[PDB]
Structure 1
Amino acid sequence: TRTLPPGVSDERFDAALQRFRDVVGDKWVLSTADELEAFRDPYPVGAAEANLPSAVVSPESTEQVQDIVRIANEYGIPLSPVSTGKNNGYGGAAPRLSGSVIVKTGERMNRILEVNEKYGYALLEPGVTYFDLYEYLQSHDSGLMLDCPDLGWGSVVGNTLDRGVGYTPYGDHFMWQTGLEVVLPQGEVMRTGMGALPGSDAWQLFPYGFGPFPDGMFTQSNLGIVTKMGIALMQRPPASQSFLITFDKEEDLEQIVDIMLPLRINMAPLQNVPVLRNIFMDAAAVSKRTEWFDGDGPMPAEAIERMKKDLDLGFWNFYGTLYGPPPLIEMYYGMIKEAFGKIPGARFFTHEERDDRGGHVLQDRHKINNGIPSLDELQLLDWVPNGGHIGFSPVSAPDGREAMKQFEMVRNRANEYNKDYAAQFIIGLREMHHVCLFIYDTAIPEAREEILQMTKVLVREAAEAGYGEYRTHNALMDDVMATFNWGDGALLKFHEKIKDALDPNGIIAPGKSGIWSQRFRGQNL
């Protein structure tokens, strides 16, 4: 059947599309089941179909975003903005609420507006991918580097707006975000920070402006459609050196993290954002599962040994990168070797030393950590046929007991539901994003529902232990937000109150982060 928006008839919906076409042109509104199949979640979760868009609209400018919002308010059409819509692992381009219209801001609004070499910033529209920006910086002989995620096909803006992470010293994307322009839910356009001051050259220079600081309210949020965003760019250092440390035992995690913290807290000698990847995660980047095991259920421990042997890796695999003058790189590599040396069976490789099949990730990290975007990590999805992943992304203290507790908790449930648990601890100064990627066969209905059931259990099992997620899939947003329920759900009530006063007709991305407008609360979609 035709996907229509909640409470909107065929007749009123065809009026609504015609008006979108008036604004953007007829080629830039997509409305047929065929055309829309490309905007389904590529990695669907649950057996029952969900998150189905009713149309895709691609505006060329801010002026058109506004007119689209107005139309959507007049007609009661929920809108779900994206940049490039590559939020794979969290829903793709697919909207939380079935029947929403996707506003793909990145199709046509993809200009790099300014890259200022002197102040080390860039002003970007939301269609600028990491590749685009990288390509610009190469062409103009730039002395700046971008900070990217594992996959560079996503948007600098879109990724920042979901508080994604990268791996250079500028890994925390939202921290370095500086000013933004946004269309609010009734059509008004606003600029934050020093951009509210007309004629200011400080919009990308000073983030805060004057009065309350609102920029975070437009992250993981449905409070507006962002049309421009600035971001600081780090200077390319004179030299770098990436390294791998392999650790043999699963139980080495505790000690790894406890040794790490005093070296990370000060941003030296661990200058970048280290990553501790388990063997399923590294194996999956270079090989298929049927190369190690072709039986049923959890990979047995002898098969885990073959992966570690052939590829010459540990169960745990620490990847890091150092930057600066060559005498500094060596001092710091020296300190790191001394500390992690304690762990029996720890082995060290720099990016110069290792160039085999197992080294393919080290070589990939050394690109990423030097702000060169890659698609090498797409190979992960060939672990099994019709491969897809979901992100279960709890936050952990930089404490080996907490991490070992989370690891065992997750593994206990991943084996119970027959899913392989690829693990990647991404390590900040004071906390760790514990990304648990469960890779699975998207074709099979039972694999998908087991993924959904399994992750619903872990959200609740994690919350009961005091752990929360930093980011989650469409299908888990209500469940995740339901865990942030201190003071009788105070945080949610606050968010719903702001939502209702900026978005009286409940128009922008309803359900995002479990925040629904008055008119959807209680309906269970």
Structure 2
Amino acid sequence: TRTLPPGVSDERFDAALQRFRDVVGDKWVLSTADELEAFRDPYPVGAAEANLPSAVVSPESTEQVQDIVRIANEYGIPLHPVSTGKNNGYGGAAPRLSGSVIVKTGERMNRILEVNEKYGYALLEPGVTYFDLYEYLQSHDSGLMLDCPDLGWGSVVGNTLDRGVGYTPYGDHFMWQTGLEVVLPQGEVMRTGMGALPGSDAWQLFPYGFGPFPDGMFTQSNLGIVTKMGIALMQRPPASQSFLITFDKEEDLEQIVDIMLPLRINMAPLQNVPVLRNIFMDAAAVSKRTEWFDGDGPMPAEAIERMKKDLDLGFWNFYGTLYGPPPLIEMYYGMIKEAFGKIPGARFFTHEERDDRGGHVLQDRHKINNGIPSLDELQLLDWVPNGGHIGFVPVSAPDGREAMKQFEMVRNRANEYNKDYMAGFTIGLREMYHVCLFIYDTADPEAREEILQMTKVLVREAAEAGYGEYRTHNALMDDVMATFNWGDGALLKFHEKIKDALDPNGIIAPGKSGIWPQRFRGQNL
């Protein structure tokens, strides 16, 4: 049965589609069931269908975005803006609110507007992928490098707008975002920062501009459709070296984290984002689950030991990258070896010392940590048939006992649903993330429903222990925002007031981050 926007008749929707076609062109509006299939969540959560788009509209310009927004206000049609729509693990391109129209800005708004070599920045449209930007930098013999997530096919802009992250020293994307242009919910256009000062050359140089600083309000947000965004770019160092440290025991996590923090907090000797990945995560990158175990339930201890031995990895595997002149790299690596070498059974390998199957993750991290985009990690999804994942990422203090508590409680819950504990821990400077990926058969309704029910429990149990998530899937946005309820839900009430003021017709991505406009509030959508 045809997916329609809430409250919009078939006939009114057909009329609205024609209005959208008049703006963007006939071939740039998709609305048949088969056309829309590719815009459904590739990794669906829950057995029942959810997050169904009614159409996709691909504008070519900011003006076209403004016109689309105006039409949507006239008809009361919700709009879900994306850049490349590769938010896989958190819903893909699919809207939180079923019946919403996807506004795929990146399809045609895909220009690199400027890369400035001297000051080190890019000004981008949403369709510029990490692969696209890398190709530009390489072909122009740039001295700059980008910072990419694990998969290079996403958007420099879209990733930033969900507060996505990478692993170089510029890994905090939002931090390095500098200036944006946004179409607000009734169709008006605004530039932030020094972009608001006509003729300023400092849009990509100074983020704040004058007065209240608004750019963060457009991240994980439903307050507009971003059409341009700037980001700072780091100079490529003269040399780099990546390394792996394998740690043999599950319980080593406590000591690893307690050493990681002091080596990272001053940004040296751990100069990049430290990542600690468990054996399940590293095995999934290079092998299928059935290589190790084809039975029912959690993987047994004997099979875990076989993964470690066959791949020459530990239960916990630390990956890092060093940058600078060779003598600096040598000094930092010496410090790292001295510190982590206090853990019995730790073994060290550089990216030059591992050409085996087990070393494939090290080789991938060496690319990612050097701003070389990759799709190697798509192999994770071959862990089981029809593989998909959902991301579950609580934030906590960088403390070894806190890490052990999280490890144990998530693994306990995963075991109940016969899901592997595939996880790592990362630190920024002062904060810790528990990066959990649950991989499952997307073709199995039971597995889809298990994932939904399990992750709802994980969210609750984490919150009960004082951990909240930094980012989440469509299916969990209400649940996660409900955990941030200090002062009787004060934060959400604040967001709601702002949403209603900027979006009185309730058009833009209703329900993103649990923030619903008045007309949808309290309706179990």
TM-score (norm 2): 1.00
Partner of 2:517: 517
In the alignment, the residues of structure 2 paired with residue 126 and residue 504 of structure 1 have an alpha-carbon distance, to the nearest angstrom, of: 26
Shift of 1:222: 0.2
Shift of 1:426: 2.2
- Say if 1:421 and 1:439, in contact at 8 Å, map to a contact too: no
In the alignment, the residues of structure 2 paired with residue 428 and residue 340 of structure 1 have an alpha-carbon distance, to the nearest angstrom, of: 18
Partner of 1:453: 453
In the alignment, the residues of structure 2 paired with residue 134 and residue 325 of structure 1 have an alpha-carbon distance, to the nearest angstrom, of: 23
In the alignment, the residues of structure 2 paired with residue 445 and residue 194 of structure 1 have an alpha-carbon distance, to the nearest angstrom, of: 50
In the alignment, the residues of structure 2 paired with residue 390 and residue 396 of structure 1 have an alpha-carbon distance, to the nearest angstrom, of: 20
1:268 alignment partner, SS class: coil
RMSD value over aligned CA atoms?
A: 0.4
In the alignment, the residues of structure 2 paired with residue 231 and residue 191 of structure 1 have an alpha-carbon distance, to the nearest angstrom, of: 14
2:469 alignment partner, SS class: coil
Shift of 1:427: 1.6
1:345 alignment partner, SS class: coil
- Say if 1:298 and 1:418, in contact at 8 Å, map to a contact too: yes
- Say if 1:114 and 1:122, in contact at 8 Å, map to a contact too: yes
2:478 alignment partner, SS class: helix
Shift of 1:444: 0.7
Shift of 1:397: 1.1
In the alignment, the residues of structure 2 paired with residue 426 and residue 133 of structure 1 have an alpha-carbon distance, to the nearest angstrom, of: 26
- Say if 1:79 and 1:508, in contact at 8 Å, map to a contact too: yes
In the alignment, the residues of structure 1 paired with residue 506 and residue 458 of structure 2 have an alpha-carbon distance, to the nearest angstrom, of: 31
1:420 alignment partner, SS class: coil
In the alignment, the residues of structure 2 paired with residue 193 and residue 434 of structure 1 have an alpha-carbon distance, to the nearest angstrom, of: 33
1:398 alignment partner, SS class: coil
Shift of 1:433: 1.9
Shift of 1:465: 0.4
2:437 alignment partner, SS class: strand
What pairs with 1:322-337 in structure 2 (closer than 5 Å)?
Answer: 322-337=322-337
Q: Please list the CA deviations of residues 252-296 of structure 1 after superposition, one character each: whole Å capped at 9, or x if unmatched.
A: 100000011110000000000011000010000000011000110
In the alignment, the residues of structure 1 paired with residue 483 and residue 396 of structure 2 have an alpha-carbon distance, to the nearest angstrom, of: 15
In the alignment, the residues of structure 1 paired with residue 465 and residue 298 of structure 2 have an alpha-carbon distance, to the nearest angstrom, of: 25
Q: Please list the CA deviations of residues 277-320 of structure 1 after superposition, one character each: whole Å capped at 9, or x if unmatched.
A: 00010000000011000110100000000000000000000000
In the alignment, the residues of structure 2 paired with residue 413 and residue 510 of structure 1 have an alpha-carbon distance, to the nearest angstrom, of: 31
Partner of 2:303: 303
In the alignment, the residues of structure 2 paired with residue 429 and residue 202 of structure 1 have an alpha-carbon distance, to the nearest angstrom, of: 28
Q: Please list the CA deviations of residues 146-166 of structure 1 after superposition, one character each: whole Å capped at 9, or x if unmatched.
A: 000000000000000000110
Q: Is residue 14 of structure 2 the alignment partner of residue 14 of structure 1?
A: yes
How many equivalent pairs are there? 525
- Say if 1:243 and 1:348, in contact at 8 Å, map to a contact too: yes
2:148 alignment partner, SS class: coil
Shift of 1:432: 1.7
Shift of 1:396: 1.9
In the alignment, the residues of structure 2 paired with residue 421 and residue 510 of structure 1 have an alpha-carbon distance, to the nearest angstrom, of: 32
In the alignment, the residues of structure 1 paired with residue 29 and residue 402 of structure 2 have an alpha-carbon distance, to the nearest angstrom, of: 48
In the alignment, the residues of structure 2 paired with residue 39 and residue 510 of structure 1 have an alpha-carbon distance, to the nearest angstrom, of: 18
Q: Please list the CA deviations of residues 336-371 of structure 1 after superposition, one character each: whole Å capped at 9, or x if unmatched.
A: 000000111000000011111000010100000000
In the alignment, the residues of structure 2 paired with residue 60 and residue 434 of structure 1 have an alpha-carbon distance, to the nearest angstrom, of: 39
In the alignment, the residues of structure 1 paired with residue 523 and residue 207 of structure 2 have an alpha-carbon distance, to the nearest angstrom, of: 39
Shift of 1:12: 0.7
Q: Please list the CA deviations of residues 63-93 of structure 1 after superposition, one character each: whole Å capped at 9, or x if unmatched.
A: 0000000000000000000000000000000
Partner of 1:207: 207
In the alignment, the residues of structure 2 paired with residue 307 and residue 384 of structure 1 have an alpha-carbon distance, to the nearest angstrom, of: 16
Moved over 2 A (4+): none
Shift of 1:421: 1.6
1:131 alignment partner, SS class: helix
- Say if 1:275 and 1:424, in contact at 8 Å, map to a contact too: yes
Shift of 1:50: 0.2
- Say if 1:506 and 1:518, in contact at 8 Å, map to a contact too: yes
Partner of 1:76: 76
In the alignment, the residues of structure 1 paired with residue 426 and residue 370 of structure 2 have an alpha-carbon distance, to the nearest angstrom, of: 16
1:395 alignment partner, SS class: strand
Q: Please list the CA deviations of residues 114-159 of structure 1 after superposition, one character each: whole Å capped at 9, or x if unmatched.
A: 0000000000000000000000000000000000000000000000
Q: Please list the CA deviations of residues 214-233 of structure 1 after superposition, one character each: whole Å capped at 9, or x if unmatched.
A: 00000000000000000000
In the alignment, the residues of structure 1 paired with residue 295 and residue 437 of structure 2 have an alpha-carbon distance, to the nearest angstrom, of: 21
In the alignment, the residues of structure 2 paired with residue 42 and residue 377 of structure 1 have an alpha-carbon distance, to the nearest angstrom, of: 16
In the alignment, the residues of structure 2 paired with residue 135 and residue 258 of structure 1 have an alpha-carbon distance, to the nearest angstrom, of: 39
In the alignment, the residues of structure 2 paired with residue 446 and residue 328 of structure 1 have an alpha-carbon distance, to the nearest angstrom, of: 53
2:245 alignment partner, SS class: strand
2:20 alignment partner, SS class: helix
2:357 alignment partner, SS class: coil
Shift of 1:434: 1.4
In the alignment, the residues of structure 2 paired with residue 209 and residue 263 of structure 1 have an alpha-carbon distance, to the nearest angstrom, of: 35
Partner of 2:408: 408
Deviates more, 1:122-131 or 1:415-424: 415-424
Partner of 2:124: 124
Q: Provide structure 1 residue ranges, at least 5 long, that are not aligned to the other structure.
A: none
In the alignment, the residues of structure 2 paired with residue 404 and residue 232 of structure 1 have an alpha-carbon distance, to the nearest angstrom, of: 36
Partner of 2:104: 104
1:110 alignment partner, SS class: coil
Q: Please list the CA deviations of residues 454-510 of structure 1 after superposition, one character each: whole Å capped at 9, or x if unmatched.
A: 000010000000000000000000000000000000000000000000000000000
In the alignment, the residues of structure 1 paired with residue 229 and residue 144 of structure 2 have an alpha-carbon distance, to the nearest angstrom, of: 18
- Say if 1:246 and 1:313, in contact at 8 Å, map to a contact too: yes
Shift of 1:435: 1.1
Q: Is residue 62 of structure 2 the alignment partner of residue 62 of structure 1?
A: yes
In the alignment, the residues of structure 1 paired with residue 426 and residue 222 of structure 2 have an alpha-carbon distance, to the nearest angstrom, of: 26
What pairs with 1:47-196 in structure 2 (closer than 5 Å)?
Answer: 47-196=47-196
Partner of 2:469: 469
2:320 alignment partner, SS class: strand
Shift of 1:424: 2.0
Q: Please list the CA deviations of residues 202-224 of structure 1 after superposition, one character each: whole Å capped at 9, or x if unmatched.
A: 00000000000000000000000
In the alignment, the residues of structure 2 paired with residue 396 and residue 422 of structure 1 have an alpha-carbon distance, to the nearest angstrom, of: 18
Partner of 1:379: 379
In the alignment, the residues of structure 2 paired with residue 125 and residue 424 of structure 1 have an alpha-carbon distance, to the nearest angstrom, of: 32
2:519 alignment partner, SS class: coil
- Say if 1:79 and 1:101, in contact at 8 Å, map to a contact too: yes
In the alignment, the residues of structure 2 paired with residue 289 and residue 432 of structure 1 have an alpha-carbon distance, to the nearest angstrom, of: 28
Shift of 1:238: 0.3
Q: Please list the CA deviations of residues 423-444 of structure 1 after superposition, one character each: whole Å capped at 9, or x if unmatched.
A: 1222210012211000001111
In the alignment, the residues of structure 2 paired with residue 367 and residue 107 of structure 1 have an alpha-carbon distance, to the nearest angstrom, of: 27
- Percent of paired sites with the same residue: 98
In the alignment, the residues of structure 2 paired with residue 495 and residue 418 of structure 1 have an alpha-carbon distance, to the nearest angstrom, of: 37
- Say if 1:161 and 1:174, in contact at 8 Å, map to a contact too: yes
1:307 alignment partner, SS class: helix
1:230 alignment partner, SS class: strand
1:114 alignment partner, SS class: strand
In the alignment, the residues of structure 2 paired with residue 420 and residue 7 of structure 1 have an alpha-carbon distance, to the nearest angstrom, of: 42
- Say if 1:257 and 1:398, in contact at 8 Å, map to a contact too: yes
2:349 alignment partner, SS class: strand
Shift of 1:51: 0.2
2:453 alignment partner, SS class: helix
1:519 alignment partner, SS class: helix
Q: Please list the CA deviations of residues 5-50 of structure 1 after superposition, one character each: whole Å capped at 9, or x if unmatched.
A: 0011001101100000000000000000000000000000001100
